[PDB]
């Protein structure tokens, strides 16, 4: 029974983060699409020409639109990748067998699209991103906010359980990104009819220092998932620190 996994990266990363998980899923016999969102990875757009969350997510939407009538996909997204899942879920609910959120923001159709971020801010210190730097971009009447991950933040708070090779790869590949907060503040929210009809799964990364477990648990407790799994020694980048475990969870959740 072949599955088609669509993998979705978080902010400032790209499809390349899945380079270890993708062959493990293909070895198991499945199809995998690892997408670069706009201005991520080797996607040719520049961040300063991306002003909406919809524009940002468009490469995932193109994958979603090209799934044939016979078919469904399994979605996996980490970190801010969860917001793009939510948009795919709202738009193509019938094309998705299960949406898996790994150490990610899991939207709630009862709240606005900013609420997860407001809740983040509420539980996490304003200095949580260490040497990351932020600057406004776009139109001065509604400015966007871009971020670049600092090498210390990445070393200590994202890749602390990964090899130095993976952290190095990351420093060579990471690009400016945005959480699109003021765009999301104006977006229509997801609905129980569409988004809320899709089966959800959650995978905990217990050693994630950028998105603490009490937080991931809050998502599960306040929104709920049909299936939850935990990877005890995954950092924020569980697909790199624990690719076999992620693959094991993903195959359990799907089969």
DSSP label of 188: P
Contact status, residue 195 vs residue 109, Cβ threshold 8 Å: yes
Per the listing, tokens 């539980």 go with 123
- State how far the Cα of 4 lies from the Cα of 88, in Å rounded to an integer: 15
Per the listing, tokens 């709920």 go with 224
Q: Cβ neighbours of residue 92 under 8 Å, at least 6 residues apart?
A: 64, 65, 67
Q: How many domains does the chain have?
A: 1
Please, which experimental method was used? X-ray
Residue 212: CA count within 13 A, CB half-sphere: 12
The tokens of 212 are what? Answer: 């603490």
DSSP label of 94: G
Name the residue range of residue 18's domain: 1-255
Contact status, residue 97 vs residue 199, Cβ threshold 8 Å: yes
- State how far the Cα of 53 lies from the Cα of 2, in Å rounded to an integer: 31
Query: What's the CATH code of the domain at 241?
Result: 3.40.50.1820
Contact status, residue 91 vs residue 64, Cβ threshold 8 Å: yes
DSSP-based three-state secondary structure for 209: coil
DSSP label of 131: T
């Amino acid at each position: 029974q072949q599955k088609h996994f669509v993998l979705v990266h978080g902010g400032c990363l790209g499809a390349w983060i899945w380079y270890k998980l993708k062959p493990l899923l293909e070895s198991a016999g499945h199809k995998v699409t690892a997408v670069d969102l706009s201005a991520a990875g080797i996607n040719p757009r520049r961040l300063d020409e991306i002003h909406t969350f919809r524009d940002y997510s468009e490469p995932l939407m193109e994958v979603m639109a090209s799934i044939p009538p016979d078919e469904k996909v399994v979605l996996l997204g980490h970190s801010f990748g969860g917001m793009s899942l939510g948009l795919a879920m709202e738009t193509y609910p019938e094309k998705i067998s299960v949406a898996v959120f790994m150490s990610a923001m899991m939207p709630d159709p009862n709240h606005s699209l900013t609420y997860p971020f407001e809740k983040y801010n509420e539980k996490c210190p304003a200095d949580m991103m260490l040497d990351s730097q932020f600057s406004t971009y776009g139109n001065p009447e509604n400015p966007g906010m871009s971020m670049i991950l600092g090498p210390q933040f990445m070393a200590l708070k994202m890749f602390q359980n990964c090899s130095v090779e993976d952290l190095e790869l990351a420093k060579m590949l990471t690009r400016p990104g945005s959480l699109f907060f003021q765009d999301l503040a104006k977006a229509k929210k997801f609905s129980t009819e569409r988004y809320g009809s899709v089966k959800r799964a959650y995978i905990f990364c217990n050693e994630d220092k950028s998105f603490p477990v009490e937080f991931q648990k809050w998502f599960v407790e306040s929104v709920g998932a049909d299936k939850v799994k935990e990877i005890k020694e995954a950092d924020a980048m569980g697909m790199l620190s624990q690719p076999r475990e992620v693959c094991k969870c993903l195959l359990d959740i799907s089969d």
